[PDB]
Short mmCIF file of C-alpha atoms in Angstrom, two decimals:
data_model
loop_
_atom_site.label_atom_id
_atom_site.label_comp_id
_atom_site.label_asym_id
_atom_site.label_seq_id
_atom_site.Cartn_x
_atom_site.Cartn_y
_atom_site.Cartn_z
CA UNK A 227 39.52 -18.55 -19.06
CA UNK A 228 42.61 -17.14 -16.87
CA UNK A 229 40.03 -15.69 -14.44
CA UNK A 230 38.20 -18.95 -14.13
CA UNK A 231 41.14 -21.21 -13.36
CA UNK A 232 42.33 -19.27 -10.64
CA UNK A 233 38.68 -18.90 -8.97
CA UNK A 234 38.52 -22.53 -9.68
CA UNK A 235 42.29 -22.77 -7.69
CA UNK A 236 41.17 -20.42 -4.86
CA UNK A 237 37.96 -22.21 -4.41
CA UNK A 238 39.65 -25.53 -4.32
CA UNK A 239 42.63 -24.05 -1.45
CA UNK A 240 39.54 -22.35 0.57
CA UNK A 241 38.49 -26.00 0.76
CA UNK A 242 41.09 -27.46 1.08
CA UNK A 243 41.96 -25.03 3.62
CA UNK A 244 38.44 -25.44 5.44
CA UNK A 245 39.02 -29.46 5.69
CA UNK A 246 42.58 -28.87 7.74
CA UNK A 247 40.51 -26.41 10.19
CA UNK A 248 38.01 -29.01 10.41
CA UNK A 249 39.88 -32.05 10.56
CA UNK A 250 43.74 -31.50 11.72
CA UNK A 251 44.86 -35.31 13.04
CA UNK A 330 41.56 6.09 2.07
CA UNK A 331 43.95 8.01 0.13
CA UNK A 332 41.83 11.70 0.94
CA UNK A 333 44.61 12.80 3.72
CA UNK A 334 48.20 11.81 0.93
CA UNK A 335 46.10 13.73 -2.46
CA UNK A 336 45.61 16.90 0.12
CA UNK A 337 49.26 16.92 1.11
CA UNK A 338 50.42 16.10 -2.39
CA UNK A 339 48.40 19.02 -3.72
CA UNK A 340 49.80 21.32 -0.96
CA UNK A 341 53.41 20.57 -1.57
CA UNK A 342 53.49 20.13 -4.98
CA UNK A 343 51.09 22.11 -6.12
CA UNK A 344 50.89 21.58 -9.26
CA UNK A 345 49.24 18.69 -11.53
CA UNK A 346 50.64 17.08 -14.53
CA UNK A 347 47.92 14.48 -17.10
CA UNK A 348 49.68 11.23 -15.77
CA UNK A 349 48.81 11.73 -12.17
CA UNK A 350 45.30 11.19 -12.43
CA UNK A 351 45.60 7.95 -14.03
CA UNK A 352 48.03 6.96 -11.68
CA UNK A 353 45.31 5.94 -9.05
CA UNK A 354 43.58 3.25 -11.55
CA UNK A 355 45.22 0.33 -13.20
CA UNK A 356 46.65 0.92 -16.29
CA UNK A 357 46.60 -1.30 -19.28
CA UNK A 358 50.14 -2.20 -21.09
CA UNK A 359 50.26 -3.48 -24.85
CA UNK A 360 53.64 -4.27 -26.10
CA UNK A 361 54.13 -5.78 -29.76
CA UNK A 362 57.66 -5.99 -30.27
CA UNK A 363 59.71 -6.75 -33.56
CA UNK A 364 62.92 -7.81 -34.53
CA UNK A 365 63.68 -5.07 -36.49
CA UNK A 366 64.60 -3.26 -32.96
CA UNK A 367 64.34 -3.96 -29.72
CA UNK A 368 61.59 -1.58 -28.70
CA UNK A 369 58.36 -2.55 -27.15
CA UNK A 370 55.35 -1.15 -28.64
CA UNK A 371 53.94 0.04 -25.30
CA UNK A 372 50.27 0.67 -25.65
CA UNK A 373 48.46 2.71 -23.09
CA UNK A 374 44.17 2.80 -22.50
CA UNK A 375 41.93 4.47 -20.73
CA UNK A 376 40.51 2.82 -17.61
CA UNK A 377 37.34 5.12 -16.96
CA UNK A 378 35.96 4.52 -20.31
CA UNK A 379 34.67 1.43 -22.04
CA UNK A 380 37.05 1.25 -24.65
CA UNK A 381 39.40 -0.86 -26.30
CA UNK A 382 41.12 -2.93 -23.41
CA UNK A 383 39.45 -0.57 -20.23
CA UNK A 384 37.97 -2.62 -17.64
CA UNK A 385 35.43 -0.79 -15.93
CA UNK A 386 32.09 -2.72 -16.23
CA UNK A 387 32.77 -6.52 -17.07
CA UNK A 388 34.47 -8.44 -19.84
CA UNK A 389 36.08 -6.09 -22.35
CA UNK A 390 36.31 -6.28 -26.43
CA UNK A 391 37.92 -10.22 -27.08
CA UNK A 392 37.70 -10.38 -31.07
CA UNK A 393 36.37 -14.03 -30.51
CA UNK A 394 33.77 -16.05 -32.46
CA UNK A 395 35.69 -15.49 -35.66
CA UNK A 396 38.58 -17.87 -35.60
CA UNK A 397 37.00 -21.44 -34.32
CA UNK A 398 34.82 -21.84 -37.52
CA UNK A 399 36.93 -21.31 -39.87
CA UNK A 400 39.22 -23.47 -38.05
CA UNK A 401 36.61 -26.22 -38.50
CA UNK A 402 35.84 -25.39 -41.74
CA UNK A 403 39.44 -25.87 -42.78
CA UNK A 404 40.00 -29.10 -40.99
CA UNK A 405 36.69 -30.86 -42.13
CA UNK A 406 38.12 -31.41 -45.33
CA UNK A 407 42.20 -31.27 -44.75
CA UNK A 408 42.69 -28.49 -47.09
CA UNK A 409 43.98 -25.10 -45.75
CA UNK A 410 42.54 -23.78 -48.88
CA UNK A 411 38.94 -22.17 -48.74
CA UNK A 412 38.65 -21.71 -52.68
CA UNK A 413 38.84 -25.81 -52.88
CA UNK A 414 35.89 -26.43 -50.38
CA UNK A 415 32.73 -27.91 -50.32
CA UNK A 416 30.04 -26.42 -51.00
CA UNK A 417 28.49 -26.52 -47.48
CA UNK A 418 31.70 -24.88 -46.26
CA UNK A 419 31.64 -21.82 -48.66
CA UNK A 420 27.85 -21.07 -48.32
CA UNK A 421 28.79 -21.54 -43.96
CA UNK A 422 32.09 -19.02 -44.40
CA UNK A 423 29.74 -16.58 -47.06
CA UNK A 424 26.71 -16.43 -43.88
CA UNK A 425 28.88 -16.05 -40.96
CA UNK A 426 30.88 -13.47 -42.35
CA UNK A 427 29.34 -10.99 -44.63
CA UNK A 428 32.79 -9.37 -45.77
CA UNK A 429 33.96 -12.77 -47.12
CA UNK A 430 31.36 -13.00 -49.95
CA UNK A 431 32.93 -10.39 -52.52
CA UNK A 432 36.34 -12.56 -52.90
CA UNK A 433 34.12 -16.13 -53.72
CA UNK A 434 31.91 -14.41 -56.38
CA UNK A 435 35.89 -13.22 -57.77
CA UNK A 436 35.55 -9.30 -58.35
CA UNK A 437 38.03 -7.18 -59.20
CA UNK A 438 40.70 -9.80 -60.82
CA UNK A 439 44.14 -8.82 -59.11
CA UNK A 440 47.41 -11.08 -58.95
CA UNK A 441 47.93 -12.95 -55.68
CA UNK A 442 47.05 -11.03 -52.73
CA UNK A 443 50.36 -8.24 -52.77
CA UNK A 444 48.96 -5.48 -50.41
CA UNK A 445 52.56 -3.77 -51.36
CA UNK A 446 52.46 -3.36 -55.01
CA UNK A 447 53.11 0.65 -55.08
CA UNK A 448 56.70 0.49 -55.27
CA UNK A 449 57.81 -1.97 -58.12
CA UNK A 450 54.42 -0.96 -60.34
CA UNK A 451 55.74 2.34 -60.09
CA UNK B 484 4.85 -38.41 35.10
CA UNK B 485 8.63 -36.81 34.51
CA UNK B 486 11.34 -37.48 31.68
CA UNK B 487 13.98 -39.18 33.79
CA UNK B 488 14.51 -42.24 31.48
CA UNK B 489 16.61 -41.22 28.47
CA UNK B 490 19.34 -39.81 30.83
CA UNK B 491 21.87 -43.23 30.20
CA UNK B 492 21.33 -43.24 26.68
CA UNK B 493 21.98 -39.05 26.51
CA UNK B 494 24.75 -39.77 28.55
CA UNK B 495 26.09 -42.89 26.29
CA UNK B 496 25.21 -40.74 22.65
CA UNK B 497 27.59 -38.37 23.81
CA UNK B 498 30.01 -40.19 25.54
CA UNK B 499 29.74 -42.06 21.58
CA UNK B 500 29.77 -38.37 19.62
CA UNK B 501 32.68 -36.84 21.96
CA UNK B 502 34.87 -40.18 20.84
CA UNK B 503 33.60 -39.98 17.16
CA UNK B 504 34.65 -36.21 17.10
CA UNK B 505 38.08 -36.84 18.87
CA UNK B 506 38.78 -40.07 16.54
CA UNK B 507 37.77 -37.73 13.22
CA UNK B 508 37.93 -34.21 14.39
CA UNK B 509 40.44 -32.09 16.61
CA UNK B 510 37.65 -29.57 18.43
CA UNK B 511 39.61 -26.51 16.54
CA UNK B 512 36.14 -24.70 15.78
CA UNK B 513 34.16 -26.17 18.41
CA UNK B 514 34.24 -23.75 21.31
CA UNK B 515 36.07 -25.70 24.08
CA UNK B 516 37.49 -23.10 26.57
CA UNK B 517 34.28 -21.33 27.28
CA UNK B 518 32.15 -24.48 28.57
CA UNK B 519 35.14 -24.60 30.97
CA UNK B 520 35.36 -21.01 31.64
CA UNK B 521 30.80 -21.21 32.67
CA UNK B 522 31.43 -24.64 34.27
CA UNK B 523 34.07 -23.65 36.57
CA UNK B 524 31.26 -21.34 38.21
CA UNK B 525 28.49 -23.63 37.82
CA UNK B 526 29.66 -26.30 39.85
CA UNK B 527 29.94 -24.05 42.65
CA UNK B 528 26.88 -22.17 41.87
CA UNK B 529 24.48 -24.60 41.03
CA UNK B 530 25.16 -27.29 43.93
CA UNK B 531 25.10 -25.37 46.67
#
């Protein structure tokens, strides 16, 4: 979306831009020396000549960035080689719509329609409907005062 | 038989586009200094 506003922005200045003329009233030679001189080659120098890819997620807890660092010449999480990289889309706006069709933030109180929509678009979803495995609440850290 | 009728109304549709393009337009893009540049040996080419 980013990318398309600003070619929509530079198409619109090259016009506008075009109107006012209209109407008016290559790095070979540096690596060789940097091998001779240095002479000597360390993993975050060949990196260095791509973009690089930052990913912070910082807390409160401390004031530390969680820097996150991928690869550019592969296609994986976050490298931009080929086209449009990894999103994680399609998986938010309908259940978005599925909660505000009937006002309740709640799936477990839906229609019918809704739950046999969520259960089809995503297959991990449909072992917590059929209720399996009773368990109180949803308390992911229960180790320390069960033990 | 020889076209020499439509030279007034040549002459008058551009007198009418060169007025048009000043009124709207300002040249800029339209090459202006080379006609002069050819002319200013034509006239003393071609005449005599």
């Amino acid at each position: 979306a980013e990318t398309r506003i600003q070619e929509n922005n530079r198409d619109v200045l090259e016009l506008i831009k075009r109107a006012v003329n209209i109407v008016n009233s290559l790095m070979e030679w540096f690596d060789i020396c940097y091998a001779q001189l240095v002479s000597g080659d360390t993993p975050a120098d060949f990196w260095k000549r791509r973009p690089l890819s930052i990913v912070p997620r910082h807390y409160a807890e401390s004031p530390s960035p969680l820097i996150v660092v991928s690869y550019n010449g592969s296609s994986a999480w976050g490298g931009r080689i080929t086209g449009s990289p990894i999103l994680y889309h399609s998986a938010q706006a309908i259940i978005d719509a599925a909660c505000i069709n009937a006002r309740v933030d709640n799936p477990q109180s839906l229609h019918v329609t809704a739950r046999q929509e969520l259960v089809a678009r995503l297959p991990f979803l449909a072992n917590v409907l059929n209720n399996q495995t009773p368990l109180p609440a949803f308390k992911p850290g229960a180790e320390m005062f069960l033990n | 038989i020889d076209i020499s009728s439509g030279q007034y109304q040549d002459r008058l549709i551009s007198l009418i586009a060169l007025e048009l393009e000043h009124r709207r337009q300002n040249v800029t893009s339209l090459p202006i200094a080379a006609v002069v540049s050819i002319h200013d040996s034509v006239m003393l080419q071609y005449e005599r």
